[PDB]
């Protein structure tokens with residue numbers, strides 16, 4: 534319904550550092566849900582704050598993406614990992 538935009542942003546910005554719900558910089562913090570939620574933060578508000586300002590080595594997106602994707606792109610990962618991360 535609206536997360537279609539999520540993949541539009543993750544597949545055009547977050548993909549450069551994830552692509553396949555698999556972190557491309559770290560070796561654990563991923564997008565699927567086990568690692569990003571292993572420690573605790575696989576929730577919209579979680580990655581939403583890790584997206585509006587990346588975190589550690591991730592590039593903020595408070596205004597890099599569009600806006601409805603700094604949001605949708607988060608709920609987006611909750612939709613892709615919850616049923617086949619764009620498998």
Ligand code: HEC
Nearest residue numbers: 547550558559562569574580583584588589590591592594
């Ligand atoms: C390359 C550098 C980037 C880019 C362009 C994006 N991410 Fe993000 N991401 C990156 C690193 C190095 C890490 C680990 C840093 C950390 O989280 O401590 C992450 C992590 C995430 C996570 C996990 C958050 C956590 O559990 O701490 C998520 C959910 C995540 N990244 C999402 C995400 C999205 C949707 C992107 C586009 C807005 C995105 N990242 C880009 C590095 C990078």
